[model samples]
Every structure is written in structure tokens, then in C-alpha cells.
Target: TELIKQGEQLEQMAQQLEQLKSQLETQKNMYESMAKTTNLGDLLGTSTNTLANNLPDNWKEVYSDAMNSSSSVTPSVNSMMGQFNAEVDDMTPSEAIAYMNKKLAEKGAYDRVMAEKAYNNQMQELSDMQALTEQIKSTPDLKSIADLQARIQTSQGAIQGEQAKLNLMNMLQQSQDKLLRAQKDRA
Candidate 1:
């Protein structure tokens, strides 16, 4: 069962890499799609999203026309239904990044949320690994120092498994942050 669990986590970690690439590609399309519109009310209005709480008064003043209007479309489509209403006032890609960040922050969306999900799942599995430490204490199990080492080995194996995830999670944060900050810079 530990074999199944360890190999399972290894495969899962590798598979998460593939998923991130695709999820990131999809999120890319969303930011670009939303950036083309002028839907301020749906994005920056107080009740529209929690992101509104973070905007400066000048931002509200700058985009108030879009905020007060009714013809503008919302920015929440996932994929297939992602047409934006260009009939509304236009948003520069820079402005769009600003708008999209607000919306993304509201959900605490992006890779940020997914990292926490993986931690929740992996914690349960790691807890089971510790439970096996109890199983080994059926003392006939450890008389051989050789046997003791294998038990100790599994302990570090689990530690490294968790550490590896933590390192990779840090990498994910840097990768996503670099992109957004660069976008903010260039825009």
C-alpha cells in the first residue's frame, strides 16, 4: 500500500506539471479576452467583486464612465462563451491587466488556490504514512538494525516528498508572479 501511495504521489506531482501548463494557457486566454472590454461596473464596483476594495480613488475616477454604464458585459466567462462586447469603450491591455488582476484576486483564483488544494490532499496521504510508523512498532519488526534503517528511510522519503512539493510550489509562485509583474511593467 505504501508502494501504491508513494508512486501515486510521484505520478500525481508529475501530472500536476502538465495540468499547470494547460490551466495556465487557459487563464492566459481569459486575461486577454477580458482585457478587450470596458466593463468597469462588473469588475470594479463595490458589490461586483471584492477586488474593488483594493482600487485607488483615482482608478475609480479614471474608469467611472464604464462603471456607471449598463451596456458593458461581464468578465466571468470560462472558455467557449468568451466573447467580449467590444461595443463598449475599449481597454488597453495595460488597463485589462489591472482589471483582470482585480477579478482574479477576488476569487483568490489562479495557481494560488490550486496550491492549497494540493496541500490539503497530500496532507491526508502524509498522515497515513505516519500512521504506518505505528504499524511498524509491532516490535518483532525492528530487532534488526537493518529493519530500523528501512523504517527510518521511509521517514526521510516522506519528508523529501513534501519538501519537493514545497520547492515546486515556490517555483510556481515565482513563474506566475514574474509574468504578471512583467505585464504590469510593460503595459
Candidate 2:
């Protein structure tokens, strides 16, 4: 069962890697398009200004206009038909209640997806680390005391298995945080 769980997790991790790559590509495309429109100095200035002074006044309107202009396009023939409680003004009490329900459902779905992915990725990583440790434990060369002593000495001060697993997670998380901050700057 553990092996099956590990296999499933490995597959999930692969799917997550693809998803992350797709997201990175999306952000990269947006960034390159923005870069083409503005000079590097001005771009840096805008970022600095935004950080120093929370995006200046009345920036949301400008940003909305810019985004709409950039993504202007006709709806596709294959578009899904759906009833969305979108930005409608002066909603009745019933409409507001329905909208809130819809929003809660959407939020629940999003959270579930995120939690599943995070759990699967973490499980897969730990399984891989443990498998490596087990391989070391099962090494036939360790039959001899001298060989065992040599291997243990070689592994001295080295955190393999669970410890290595945690260290890897921390390092990856830090890298992700840095990338997130970089993307925030672009935004």
C-alpha cells in the first residue's frame, strides 16, 4: 500500500511540475509583453514607486484598463455557457445570497485542489527520500563489519532519509518564496 501510495504521489508530482511550468510560462509571457511596451528604467521605476508608495492613487482603474486592452479578443465559439454572479450592480437580497453561496463553493473547490497537490507533492518527496535510505540499508556490501564501519563513517554528519527530506523541502520553499517575490515586483 505504501508503494502504491508512493507511485500515485510520484504521478501527482509530475502533474504538478507541468502545472507549475505552464504558470511560469504564462507569467513570463506577460512580463515580456510588458517589457516590450516600456523601457527597462521606467519599469524598474514603476516597481520601486509601487513598493515605496502602495501603487500610487487610482491605480486599479489604470491597471484594469491596461489588462483589458492587452487581452482584448472576441469570445470563442467553444465558450462554455454558464450563469455567473459577475459584477452586477444593485443586486437584490436573494441575488446577493446566491452570489455568496456560489463564491463559497468556488473557494472550497480551489482550496481542496491546493491542499491535495501540496499533500501529494510532500508525500512523493518523502517517499523518494526514504527509498534512497532503504537502498543504503539493504546494500549487500554492508555484510562485513569493516564495510559497515566504512559506510557509516562515510555517512557521518550527513542527514539522509527523513532529515534530508525536510532540508530539501525547506530549500525548495525558500526558492519558491524568492520567485514569488520576483513576480510580485513584476506585478
Candidate 3:
């Protein structure tokens, strides 16, 4: 039964890796498509900004008109703010800023919340490991050392697994952030 469980766990990890690979490939293709659009800058023998600067004289007027006139087609400020939340009609500017920070601190922001949760999880695992170690030490004949070590090993393994999952998630986040930054820079 133990062997079967370990095999099942390994299979799940492999599936996760496969999913990650698929996501990476999709991102690569998207980036490649974006890159093709940008290579026109190189072909024109100019910086990307130079190419942008060479737009038709009416391009700025068209862009400004489109931006100012497209209320229905445009996204709202709330969506553009990402995770931020705020209300300021009744408060001064400083008060509104402080309120926003207080709300964010309460939620710990997303990254800080995840980090705190991981820290608590590791603390729990360490506590369990310490208990097992104490149990081994208090055994008069040291005959329980193997059992205690096995339990401690299991706890450590679980913690390591959690860390690996967190690392993968963090990597995915960074990759997505890089993609967004590259797109923003190109624009």
C-alpha cells in the first residue's frame, strides 16, 4: 500500500510538470508571435521608437480621438487597478491613501499572504519534527530511534514538497510578469 501511494504521488508530480510544460509552450508561442510583429522595427533600420515616430501625421489625432471618444469600448478604472480597492469621497487624499494601505495590509496583499501561509506551514512541520526528535531522545534504550526518524523524515519530506510547489508557482508568476512587462515595453 505504501509503495502504491508513493507511485500515485509521483504520477501526480509528473502531471504537474507536464502542465507546466504546456503552459510554457503556449507562452513561448505567444511571445514568438509578438516578436514577429516587433521585428519590423529591425527591418526598417531604426529603433522601435523611431518606427513609432514615423507614423502618419494624423496618427496622433486619430489616437487621441479614439481614446477620448471610446467610452463604451474602454475598460473602467476599477479593472485597470488590478487588485486595489479604495473609496475616497468622504476622506482627504492622505486619509484615502492610508485607508488603501490598511486594507492591503489586512489582506497581506497576495504575495505576502502566500509567504505567511508558507511560513506557518513550515513552522508546523518543524514543530512536528522537534516532537519526534524529543520522542527519540527520551527513549531509554534508543530502540525507537528508527520509528522516530521515519516520522521526522516524513515531515521533512512533506515540507520539501510544499516548498517545491511554491517554487513552481512563483516561477510561473515571474514568467507571466516578464511577459506582461515585455508587452508593455513594446507598446
**Against the true structure, what is each candidate's TM-score?**
0.26, 0.25, 0.33
After superposition, candidate 1 runs with Cα above 4 Å error: 1-132, 135-139, 143-152
Give the winner by TM-score: 3
Best by lDDT: 1
lDDT of each: 0.36, 0.32, 0.35
- Candidate ranking under TM-score, highest first, comes to 3, 1, 2
**Which candidate, 2 or 3, would have the higher lDDT against the true structure?**
3
**Candidate 3 residue lDDT tens string, 50-147:** 21211122222222222232121112112222232223235333333333323323433233334445444545544554555444444422335445
Error of 3 at 129 (Å): 2.9
Give the RMSD in angstroms, all C-alphas superposed, for model 3. 17.6
- Extract clashing residue pairs from model 2: none
Positional deviation of residue 156's Cα in model 1 after best superposition, in angstroms: 2.1
Candidate 3's C-alpha lDDT?
0.35
